Amino acid sequence: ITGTSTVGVGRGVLGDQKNINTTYSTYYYLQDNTRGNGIFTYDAKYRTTLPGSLWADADNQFFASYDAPAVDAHYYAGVTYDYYKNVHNRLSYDGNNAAIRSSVHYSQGYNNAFWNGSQMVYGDGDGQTFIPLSGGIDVVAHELTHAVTDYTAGLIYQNESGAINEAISDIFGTLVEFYANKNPDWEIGEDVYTPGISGDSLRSMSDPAKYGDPDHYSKRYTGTQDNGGVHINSGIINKAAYLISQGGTHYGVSVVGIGRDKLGKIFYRALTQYLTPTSNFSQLRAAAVQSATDLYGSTSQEVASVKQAFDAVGVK
Ligand SMILES: [Ca+2]
Ligand SMILES: [Ca+2]
Ligand SMILES: [Ca+2]
Ligand SMILES: [Ca+2]
Ligand SMILES: [Zn+2]
């Protein structure tokens, strides 16, 4: 809507206070006009109809329990937009400042979050397995990254291409978590997963096997479940990304870490310049090697580490 840009205050899912960009026109709306064509957050009101109604508030103060998921979805979408703009010089997900839209309070006791091809959607969780999903910065960044992938490589959400699609979202979800410096780690969804259990997460990039996901190509899932194991086989790529950044010895293969910044640069270039809709793991290796070569030279330590990392996880 058309109005005056202002700043409100509220509390997120984890009880932390933060300032959020809003728009005033009779009501205060969760509409951030400071980033691209805007960031809009909607209330799905426990229904499945999308996007719902643009979030309206009477006093620009969002401290109600019902407001929490909206506060975080709105705020973290902003942080993710900043990451892509400041670190990769990318304006929004389409590269042309497309408006970012998110709907919270989707359905009842819904344990997932997703990008539906047009916007992000967040469930509130069942209170046991998950609390409102927008409370996790890595979750929000994971979802917005699916939008970036859709407008670039266009990786099909099935089999190996789908596993890469998923890994890319976990990789950048984690890099954004480090960017925001919010208790960063190489785990996925730890802030909103199982509130009754501390120290766990949905997936682990440092050690995928911790939760039963493969950490080597020889252990890849070849079934039909989960669209060919897109959330399972992503562990093979996540482990490779972790090794490239942090280094380590995996299955007898030693990798010298080159850091998170370079990891981000290499994968962003691979995603936007070399990957295609049907790229498989072997092609991802080639794309990553070529990207590192473009940026640091064929005889660089960076290229060597990328090769070692993929060798470690058995991707030739
Ligand atoms: Ca209020
Ligand atoms: Ca964390
Ligand atoms: Ca995390
Ligand atoms: Ca937990
Ligand atoms: Zn995903």
DSSP string computed for the chain: ---EEEEEEEE-TTS-EEEEEEEEESEEESEETTSTT-EEEEE-TTSSSSS-EE-EESSSEE-STTTHHHHHHHHHHHHHHHHHHHHH---TTTSS-PPEEEEEEESSS---EEE-SS-EEEE---SSSBS-GGG-HHHHHHHHHHHHHHHTT---SSHHHHHHHHHHHHHHHHHHHHHHTSS--SEESTTTB-TTSSS--SEESS-GGGGT--SSGGG---SSHHHHHTTTTHHHHHHHHHHHHH-EEETTEEE----HHHHHHHHHHIIIII--TT--HHHHHHHHHHHHHHHH-TTSHHHHHHHHHHHHTT--
Distance (Å, whole) CA 212 – CA 215? 9
Distance (Å, whole) CA 111 – CA 129? 7
223: tokens are 């079934």
Q: What's the CA-to-centroid distance between 255 and ligand 4, angstroms?
A: 31
Radius of gyration of the chain (CA): 19
From residue 201, alpha-carbon distances to 132, 158, 193, 205, 273 in Å are 15, 24, 6, 10, 32
> Which among 35, 8, 37 is positioned nearest to 21, based on CA atoms?
8
Contact 149, 170 (CB under 8 A): no
Say whether 146 counts as a known binding-site residue. yes
Distance (Å, whole) CA 260 – CA 238? 13
Catalytic residue among 105, 143, 160, 302: 143
Contact 125, 111 (CB under 8 A): yes
Residue 115 sits at the vertex; the CA angle it makes with 109 and 117, to the nearest 5 degrees, is 135
Distance (Å, whole) CA 13 – CA 11? 7
Q: Which ligand is nearest to the CA of 63?
A: 1
Give every CB contact of residue 249 below 8 A, 6+ residues apart in sequence.
255, 312
Q: What's the CA-to-centroid distance between 27 and ligand 1, angstroms?
A: 10
Say whether 194 counts as a known binding-site residue. yes
Q: What's the CA-to-centroid distance between 308 and ligand 3, angstroms?
A: 25
Inter-residue long-range contacts of 279-285, CB under 8 Å, 24+ positions, other chains counted? 279/153, 279/155, 279/160, 279/161, 279/164, 280/159, 280/160, 280/161, 280/164, 281/160, 281/163, 281/164, 281/217, 281/236, 281/237, 281/315, 282/315, 282/316, 284/164, 284/237, 284/315, 285/310, 285/315, 285/316
Q: Which ligand is nearest to the CA of 203?
A: 3
Q: Which ligand is nearest to the CA of 145?
A: 5
Say whether 61 counts as a known binding-site residue. yes
Residue 231 appears among annotated catalytic residues: yes
CATH classification code of 6-154 = 3.10.170.10
Residue written as token pair 């969780």: 125
CATH classification code of 155-315 = 1.10.390.10
Say whether 57 counts as a known binding-site residue. yes
Alpha-carbon 264 to chain mean position: 13
Sheet holding 61-62, edge to edge: 56-57, 27-29, 17-25, 4-11, 61-62
Contact 72, 135 (CB under 8 A): yes
How was this structure determined? It was done by X-ray
Biggest CA–CA distance in the chain, Å, is: 64
Residue 161 sits at the vertex; the CA angle it makes with 247 and 175, to the nearest 5 degrees, is 40
Alpha-carbon 137 to chain mean position: 8
Contact 120, 102 (CB under 8 A): yes
Catalytic residue among 74, 105, 216, 231: 231
Q: What's the CA-to-centroid distance between 177 and ligand 3, angstroms?
A: 6
Q: What's the CA-to-centroid distance between 229 and ligand 3, angstroms?
A: 21
Say whether 302 counts as a known binding-site residue. no
Q: Which amino acid is at 181?
A: N
Residue 143 appears among annotated catalytic residues: yes
Q: What's the CA-to-centroid distance between 8 and ligand 1, angstroms?
A: 9
> Which among 230, 176, 39 is positioned nearest to 119, based on CA atoms?
39
Q: What's the CA-to-centroid distance between 114 and ligand 1, angstroms?
A: 27
260: tokens are 């998170």
Resolution of the structure in the document, Å: 1.7
Q: Which amino acid is at 80?
A: T
Within the chain, which residue ranges are assigned CATH 1.10.390.10?
Answer: 155-315
Say whether 197 counts as a known binding-site residue. yes
Q: Which ligand is nearest to the CA of 186?
A: 3
User: CB within 5 A of ion ligand 5: which residues?
Assistant: 169
Within the chain, which residue ranges are assigned CATH 3.10.170.10?
Answer: 6-154
Q: Which amino acid is at 164?
A: I
Say whether 193 counts as a known binding-site residue. yes
